[PDB]
């Protein structure tokens, strides 16, 4: 209840007990000239003042220092050579050791382990267990607070554990520390490197499922590489453990619980440091921000996870200081129950560097079902607010998986959510930029303000309706997508689609249509397109695509693929910059643009060296079939504002607008313009008569001689080009004469 930060900082400054009759022992001749000798330690030297026994209540054994647990036993050797070793001092209750061994090497373990722990008494004392060795080497397990017996008896308070070599502390494989409710450990070599099973929090009675459990291991002192190996946070309880780091902070393997949670803290930037009764200052920190070079490099989360269901999950949870939270290549596992598990990667001052697949009960899809909602978080940087949280590697999230970041720049290179379904893909805390790579969508609630996906695909959810991508909130202005590629839905329904919210403008360069896949566009003002749009089946396009939009703008170059298999719907101000939209006809019917409200459009004098002509800014292709005099709706429309960068084409006149677009427009066939054929040399003579169907431009090139930097327009081919209507009537494919009209010359601007 009262949380690991007050608990830490009410046992950080604690004098440490009142110790009548303090037992001094001195290693005297003998133990410093054998520099090898593998004494022993407690049968040697220290079961002078330790006496063991038997406590009724909670029995399996009992130690203590002599005559009660409130008496300080110090021991000062300060050039013992040799190896000592502990094996087998079990619950010592004790109180206040002191072993000054420098130039000694100790051992904690040979074919025992030990225990270090307190009583409950009236005046609540702690151990203060020390040590000074030179090397550690703990070589067997030891726990730090444990249960004495089972239960009953005396309960246990809470105890300190003091090591400080000089060289290093390492660990076995099989040596098992493992601190309990009160325990802390204090650790002050350089290079402590422990490979065994390090145990913050651990179920110290045997039913306690309640219990707070919070523990320490304070490695602050540790000049060199601190290294654990496989850290195991909590046991079927909340435990709350926490580590109050060195700036540099390699782990291996860690394994939260359901709802345990951890504190590695970094240093900060400049490293640390009647009658009334006044009582001391109890200095006390909240959480401040790490410093610069401050590193955690954990390499695996797991997260084991059984038991009971509650009405939410848990929240296994870590919270760091340090300025660079990196995740390793093992990523991020998260066990789920039937209720669904979450895991908060938090991070208050700094950044996170995710390297690994999230996977989920280890595997890299993660099926889960409703009610079990496995909840990945991140918070990179909530205090400063400008953390980014970048990822490198390709995410993959499978069914009921809900991925959520809170930073300030979430960089990443691909989310893979078209595998399951139902995927909160939450990005609402992001301030700014989400520079997502590559997107895979089935079902999502993508929540993003403003990003920059530069390529995009949205797939389908088989036959079942009512789920589909969902920007569900503001996209705003800056938003971007660099490639759209709809895929190709099912039979004759819409399953999958895309739908916006809110938003007033997102440049897309690159779209492509598909057969029932909607691309709804809702709300949003300036739908942009720049480059290439087209379908997913050029060959062979089929049923429609839902282009529902509210208003669009095209830009420049931006070629379009326009067929009467999307019912491209507009209710907004079609604007068309200098760019080319080409028709296909599909059986001689040309599919009209109905336009709701305005279709505005304004060019240049878009001049090309490919005809000598103007780039032709609407292509009409595949016009073999079109049914001459026919009626054909080109486009329909509201008002055409039709315009140029200036008042007259070739420069500058009083010319009216729509006569031009006449000439600019184009009726291609054969690898050629059956509309008009602009003329430069010979050689398109041949191509030009192949165009138009007749042999007096084929076998003979000087049979016309009009057309040495002029043009001709082909009569009987009518286009409407007035404010409400824009048609094609093609009613003769005209042989044109020589020097009788329809002649006209070369635009000449390049």
């Not at 839902?546 to 939009?549: P, T, V």
């Given at each position: 209840l009262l949380g690991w930060g007050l608990k830490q900082a009410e046992e950080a400054n604690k004098t440490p007990d009142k110790p009548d009759k303090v037992w001094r022992i001195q290693a005297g001749k003998?133990?410093?000239?054998?520099?090898?000798?593998?004494?022993?330690?407690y049968k040697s030297l220290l079961s002078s003042k330790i006496d063991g026994g038997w406590d009724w209540g909670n029995a399996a054994t009992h130690y203590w220092i002599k005559g009660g647990q409130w008496n300080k036993l110090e021991v000062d050797m300060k050039d013992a050579v040799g190896t000592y070793k502990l094996s087998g001092l079990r619950n010592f209750t004790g109180g206040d050791l002191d072993v000054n061994m420098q130039k000694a090497t100790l051992r904690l373990g040979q074919f025992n382990g030990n225990s270090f722990t307190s009583y409950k008494d009236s005046a609540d004392r702690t151990t203060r267990v020390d040590f000074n060795a030179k090397n550690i080497l703990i070589d067997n397990f030891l726990e730090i607070n444990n249960r004495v017996g089972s239960g009953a008896g005396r309960k246990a308070s809470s105890t300190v554990l003091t090591l400080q070599a000089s060289e290093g502390i390492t660990s076995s494989k099989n040596a098992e520390i493992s601190l309990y409710d009160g325990a802390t450990l204090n650790l002050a070599s350089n290079s402590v490197k422990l490979n065994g099973n390090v145990w913050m929090g651990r179920l110290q009675y045997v039913g306690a499922y309640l219990a707070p459990s919070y523990s320490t291991i304070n490695t602050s002192k540790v000049t060199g590489e601190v290294n654990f190996n496989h850290l195991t946070v909590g046991d079927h309880n909340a435990a709350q453990a926490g580590i109050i780091a060195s700036n540099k902070t390699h782990i291996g393997t860690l394994d939260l619980w359901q709802s345990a949670g951890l504190n590695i803290i970094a240093p900060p930037e400049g490293g640390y440091k009647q009658k009334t009764e006044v009582q001391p200052t109890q200095v006390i920190d909240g959480p401040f921000a790490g410093g610069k070079d401050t590193v955690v490099n954990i390499d695996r989360i797991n997260t084991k996870a059984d038991g009971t269901i509650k009405v939410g999950g848990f929240k296994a949870s870590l919270t760091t200081n340090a300025a660079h939270l990196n995740i390793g290549k093992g990523g991020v596992n998260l066990s789920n129950q039937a209720s669904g598990r979450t895991l908060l990667v938090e991070n208050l001052t700094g950044n996170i560097t995710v390297d690994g697949p999230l996977r989920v009960n280890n595997q890299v899809g993660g099926y889960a079902l409703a009610?079990?909602?496995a909840n990945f978080e991140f918070k990179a940087g909530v205090d400063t607010k400008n953390g980014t949280a970048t990822f490198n590697n390709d995410i993959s999230l499978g069914r009921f998986v809900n991925l959520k970041v809170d930073a300030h720049t979430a960089n990443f290179k691909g989310i893979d959510t078209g595998n399951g379904g139902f995927n909160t893909l939450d990005f609402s805390g992001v301030t700014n930029k989400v520079n997502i790579n590559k997107l895979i969508t089935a079902s999502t609630n993508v929540a993003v303000k403003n990003f920059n996906i530069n390529e995009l695909i949205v797939k389908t959810n088989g036959?079942?309706?009512?789920?589909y991508t969902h920007f569900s909130e503001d996209i705003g202005s800056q938003s971007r997508i660099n490639t759209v590629r709809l895929e190709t839905g099912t039979r004759?329904?819409?399953s999958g689609g895309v739908k916006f919210k809110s938003g007033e403008k997102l440049v897309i360069d690159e779209f492509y249509y598909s057969p029932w896949n909607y691309f709804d566009a809702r709300n949003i003002k300036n739908v942009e397109i720049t480059r290439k749009f087209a379908s997913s089946t050029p060959e062979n396009p089929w049923g429609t695509s839902?282009?529902?939009?509210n208003n669009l703008t095209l830009g420049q170059n931006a070629v379009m693929d326009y067929s009467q298999f999307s019912n491209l719907t507009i209710q907004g101000d079609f604007i068309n910059n200098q760019g080319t939209i080409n028709y296909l006809v599909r059986g001689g019917k040309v599919a009209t643009l109905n336009v709701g409200n305005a279709a505005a459009m304004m060019f240049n004098n878009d001049i090309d060296s490919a005809t000598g002509f103007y780039k032709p800014l609407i292509k009409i292709n595949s016009a073999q079939d079109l049914i001459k005099n026919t009626e054909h709706v080109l486009l329909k429309a509201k008002i055409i504002g039709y315009g140029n960068v200036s008042t007259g084409t070739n420069g500058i006149s009083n010319v009216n607008l729509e006569e031009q677009f006449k000439e600019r427009l184009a009726l291609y066939n054969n690898n050629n313009r059956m509309d008009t054929c602009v003329v430069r040399n010979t050689d398109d003579i041949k191509a030009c008569g192949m165009a138009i169907g007749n042999q007096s431009m084929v076998n003979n090139p000087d049979n016309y001689k009009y057309l040495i930097g002029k043009a001709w327009k082909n009569i009987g081919i009518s286009k409407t080009a007035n404010g409400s209507k824009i048609s094609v009537y093609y009613l003769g494919n005209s042989t044109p004469t020589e020097n009788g009209g329809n002649t006209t010359n070369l635009p000449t601007n390049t």
């Open positions: 003998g133990f410093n000239e054998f520099p090898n000798k593998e004494y022993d330690l009610g079990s909602s036959v079942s309706v009512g789920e004759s329904i819409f839902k282009l529902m939009f």
